[PDB]
mmCIF file with all atom_site columns, C-alpha atoms and ligand atoms in Angstrom:
data_model
loop_
_atom_site.group_PDB
_atom_site.id
_atom_site.type_symbol
_atom_site.label_atom_id
_atom_site.label_alt_id
_atom_site.label_comp_id
_atom_site.label_asym_id
_atom_site.label_entity_id
_atom_site.label_seq_id
_atom_site.pdbx_PDB_ins_code
_atom_site.Cartn_x
_atom_site.Cartn_y
_atom_site.Cartn_z
_atom_site.occupancy
_atom_site.B_iso_or_equiv
_atom_site.pdbx_formal_charge
_atom_site.auth_seq_id
_atom_site.auth_comp_id
_atom_site.auth_asym_id
_atom_site.auth_atom_id
_atom_site.pdbx_PDB_model_num
ATOM   1  C  CA  . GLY A 1 1  ? -20.975 78.627 277.849 1.00 0.00 ? 1   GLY A CA  1
ATOM   2  C  CA  . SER A 1 2  ? -20.933 76.097 275.801 1.00 0.00 ? 2   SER A CA  1
ATOM   3  C  CA  . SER A 1 3  ? -22.694 73.503 275.219 1.00 0.00 ? 3   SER A CA  1
ATOM   4  C  CA  . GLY A 1 4  ? -22.931 70.128 273.225 1.00 0.00 ? 4   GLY A CA  1
ATOM   5  C  CA  . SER A 1 5  ? -25.418 68.159 271.529 1.00 0.00 ? 5   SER A CA  1
ATOM   6  C  CA  . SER A 1 6  ? -25.065 63.994 271.769 1.00 0.00 ? 6   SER A CA  1
ATOM   7  C  CA  . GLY A 1 7  ? -27.532 61.603 270.354 1.00 0.00 ? 7   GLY A CA  1
ATOM   8  C  CA  . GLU A 1 8  ? -27.366 59.654 267.240 1.00 0.00 ? 8   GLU A CA  1
ATOM   9  C  CA  . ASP A 1 9  ? -30.058 56.928 265.978 1.00 0.00 ? 9   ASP A CA  1
ATOM   10 C  CA  . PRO A 1 10 ? -30.865 53.683 266.294 1.00 0.00 ? 10  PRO A CA  1
ATOM   11 C  CA  . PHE A 1 11 ? -31.368 52.331 262.915 1.00 0.00 ? 11  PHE A CA  1
ATOM   12 C  CA  . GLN A 1 12 ? -27.784 53.382 261.924 1.00 0.00 ? 12  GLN A CA  1
ATOM   13 C  CA  . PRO A 1 13 ? -24.616 50.752 261.640 1.00 0.00 ? 13  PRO A CA  1
ATOM   14 C  CA  . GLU A 1 14 ? -22.840 50.045 264.774 1.00 0.00 ? 14  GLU A CA  1
ATOM   15 C  CA  . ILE A 1 15 ? -19.270 50.036 262.708 1.00 0.00 ? 15  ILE A CA  1
ATOM   16 C  CA  . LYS A 1 16 ? -16.123 50.000 265.378 1.00 0.00 ? 16  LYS A CA  1
ATOM   17 C  CA  . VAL A 1 17 ? -13.858 50.173 262.497 1.00 0.00 ? 17  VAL A CA  1
ATOM   18 C  CA  . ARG A 1 18 ? -10.296 48.555 265.424 1.00 0.00 ? 18  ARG A CA  1
ATOM   19 C  CA  . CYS A 1 19 ? -8.502  48.822 262.252 1.00 0.00 ? 19  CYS A CA  1
ATOM   20 C  CA  . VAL A 1 20 ? -4.136  49.670 262.247 1.00 0.00 ? 20  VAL A CA  1
ATOM   21 C  CA  . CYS A 1 21 ? -4.399  52.194 259.895 1.00 0.00 ? 21  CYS A CA  1
ATOM   22 C  CA  . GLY A 1 22 ? -5.741  54.924 263.048 1.00 0.00 ? 22  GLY A CA  1
ATOM   23 C  CA  . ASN A 1 23 ? -8.993  55.717 260.869 1.00 0.00 ? 23  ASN A CA  1
ATOM   24 C  CA  . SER A 1 24 ? -12.320 55.669 262.328 1.00 0.00 ? 24  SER A CA  1
ATOM   25 C  CA  . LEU A 1 25 ? -14.405 55.639 258.993 1.00 0.00 ? 25  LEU A CA  1
ATOM   26 C  CA  . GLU A 1 26 ? -15.903 52.686 257.148 1.00 0.00 ? 26  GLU A CA  1
ATOM   27 C  CA  . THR A 1 27 ? -16.095 51.765 252.855 1.00 0.00 ? 27  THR A CA  1
ATOM   28 C  CA  . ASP A 1 28 ? -17.969 49.365 251.211 1.00 0.00 ? 28  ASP A CA  1
ATOM   29 C  CA  . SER A 1 29 ? -15.358 46.697 251.913 1.00 0.00 ? 29  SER A CA  1
ATOM   30 C  CA  . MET A 1 30 ? -14.579 45.346 255.036 1.00 0.00 ? 30  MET A CA  1
ATOM   31 C  CA  . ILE A 1 31 ? -13.536 42.261 256.924 1.00 0.00 ? 31  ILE A CA  1
ATOM   32 C  CA  . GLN A 1 32 ? -15.448 40.729 260.442 1.00 0.00 ? 32  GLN A CA  1
ATOM   33 C  CA  . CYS A 1 33 ? -13.339 39.150 263.205 1.00 0.00 ? 33  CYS A CA  1
ATOM   34 C  CA  . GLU A 1 34 ? -14.208 35.532 263.489 1.00 0.00 ? 34  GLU A CA  1
ATOM   35 C  CA  . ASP A 1 35 ? -14.848 35.757 267.079 1.00 0.00 ? 35  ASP A CA  1
ATOM   36 C  CA  . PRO A 1 36 ? -17.734 36.684 268.241 1.00 0.00 ? 36  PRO A CA  1
ATOM   37 C  CA  . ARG A 1 37 ? -17.372 39.572 271.003 1.00 0.00 ? 37  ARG A CA  1
ATOM   38 C  CA  . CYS A 1 38 ? -14.522 41.476 268.866 1.00 0.00 ? 38  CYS A CA  1
ATOM   39 C  CA  . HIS A 1 39 ? -16.463 41.640 265.863 1.00 0.00 ? 39  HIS A CA  1
ATOM   40 C  CA  . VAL A 1 40 ? -14.848 44.311 264.993 1.00 0.00 ? 40  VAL A CA  1
ATOM   41 C  CA  . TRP A 1 41 ? -14.047 45.783 261.235 1.00 0.00 ? 41  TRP A CA  1
ATOM   42 C  CA  . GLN A 1 42 ? -10.960 46.404 259.850 1.00 0.00 ? 42  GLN A CA  1
ATOM   43 C  CA  . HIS A 1 43 ? -10.494 47.426 256.201 1.00 0.00 ? 43  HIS A CA  1
ATOM   44 C  CA  . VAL A 1 44 ? -9.525  45.503 252.852 1.00 0.00 ? 44  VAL A CA  1
ATOM   45 C  CA  . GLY A 1 45 ? -7.003  46.987 251.655 1.00 0.00 ? 45  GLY A CA  1
ATOM   46 C  CA  . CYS A 1 46 ? -4.936  48.148 255.336 1.00 0.00 ? 46  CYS A CA  1
ATOM   47 C  CA  . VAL A 1 47 ? -4.926  44.301 256.846 1.00 0.00 ? 47  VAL A CA  1
ATOM   48 C  CA  . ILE A 1 48 ? -5.126  41.868 253.795 1.00 0.00 ? 48  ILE A CA  1
ATOM   49 C  CA  . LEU A 1 49 ? -2.051  42.092 251.574 1.00 0.00 ? 49  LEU A CA  1
ATOM   50 C  CA  . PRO A 1 50 ? -2.947  42.328 247.214 1.00 0.00 ? 50  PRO A CA  1
ATOM   51 C  CA  . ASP A 1 51 ? -2.750  38.753 245.341 1.00 0.00 ? 51  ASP A CA  1
ATOM   52 C  CA  . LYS A 1 52 ? 0.184   39.278 242.903 1.00 0.00 ? 52  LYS A CA  1
ATOM   53 C  CA  . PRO A 1 53 ? 0.682   35.812 242.700 1.00 0.00 ? 53  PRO A CA  1
ATOM   54 C  CA  . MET A 1 54 ? -2.895  34.435 243.252 1.00 0.00 ? 54  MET A CA  1
ATOM   55 C  CA  . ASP A 1 55 ? -4.599  37.994 241.809 1.00 0.00 ? 55  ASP A CA  1
ATOM   56 C  CA  . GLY A 1 56 ? -8.030  36.516 242.034 1.00 0.00 ? 56  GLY A CA  1
ATOM   57 C  CA  . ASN A 1 57 ? -9.741  34.189 243.843 1.00 0.00 ? 57  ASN A CA  1
ATOM   58 C  CA  . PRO A 1 58 ? -9.371  32.363 246.136 1.00 0.00 ? 58  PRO A CA  1
ATOM   59 C  CA  . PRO A 1 59 ? -11.079 35.167 247.749 1.00 0.00 ? 59  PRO A CA  1
ATOM   60 C  CA  . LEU A 1 60 ? -11.370 36.794 251.138 1.00 0.00 ? 60  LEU A CA  1
ATOM   61 C  CA  . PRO A 1 61 ? -10.134 34.011 253.469 1.00 0.00 ? 61  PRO A CA  1
ATOM   62 C  CA  . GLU A 1 62 ? -13.077 32.650 255.584 1.00 0.00 ? 62  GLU A CA  1
ATOM   63 C  CA  . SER A 1 63 ? -11.490 33.316 258.794 1.00 0.00 ? 63  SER A CA  1
ATOM   64 C  CA  . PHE A 1 64 ? -9.159  35.559 259.940 1.00 0.00 ? 64  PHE A CA  1
ATOM   65 C  CA  . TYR A 1 65 ? -8.447  37.684 263.193 1.00 0.00 ? 65  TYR A CA  1
ATOM   66 C  CA  . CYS A 1 66 ? -8.074  41.341 263.516 1.00 0.00 ? 66  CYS A CA  1
ATOM   67 C  CA  . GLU A 1 67 ? -4.772  42.767 265.408 1.00 0.00 ? 67  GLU A CA  1
ATOM   68 C  CA  . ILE A 1 68 ? -6.206  42.074 269.357 1.00 0.00 ? 68  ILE A CA  1
ATOM   69 C  CA  . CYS A 1 69 ? -7.042  38.113 268.575 1.00 0.00 ? 69  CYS A CA  1
ATOM   70 C  CA  . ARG A 1 70 ? -3.855  37.293 265.495 1.00 0.00 ? 70  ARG A CA  1
ATOM   71 C  CA  . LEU A 1 71 ? -1.663  38.466 268.724 1.00 0.00 ? 71  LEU A CA  1
ATOM   72 C  CA  . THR A 1 72 ? -3.426  37.113 271.036 1.00 0.00 ? 72  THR A CA  1
ATOM   73 C  CA  . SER A 1 73 ? -2.347  33.374 271.366 1.00 0.00 ? 73  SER A CA  1
ATOM   74 C  CA  . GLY A 1 74 ? -0.099  32.449 273.562 1.00 0.00 ? 74  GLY A CA  1
ATOM   75 C  CA  . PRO A 1 75 ? -1.487  30.921 276.480 1.00 0.00 ? 75  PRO A CA  1
ATOM   76 C  CA  . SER A 1 76 ? 0.483   33.159 279.637 1.00 0.00 ? 76  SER A CA  1
ATOM   77 C  CA  . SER A 1 77 ? -1.363  30.971 282.048 1.00 0.00 ? 77  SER A CA  1
ATOM   78 C  CA  . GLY A 1 78 ? 0.405   32.770 285.157 1.00 0.00 ? 78  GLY A CA  1
HETATM 79 ZN ZN1 . ZN  B 2 .  ? -7.099  50.859 257.753 1.00 0.00 ? 101 ZN  B ZN1 1
HETATM 80 ZN ZN1 . ZN  B 2 .  ? -10.505 40.707 267.143 1.00 0.00 ? 102 ZN  B ZN1 1
#
């Protein structure tokens, strides 16, 4: 038989990284979902598009919604 050690330290950032790319890693650049419950992390150079014409300011959108939120728009009240 084998064993398995599990138990991280409470002194670490509980990041989610619900990015689309599929990668569950973190870097020195990410956008948090406006939603309180969601508060998911999503790489900047993944969902956010490049600013060819703008090439700068304004900076990242203060009001951004992940793929889980951006998709949830319709009421679907049945
Ligand atoms: Zn990503
Ligand atoms: Zn969200």
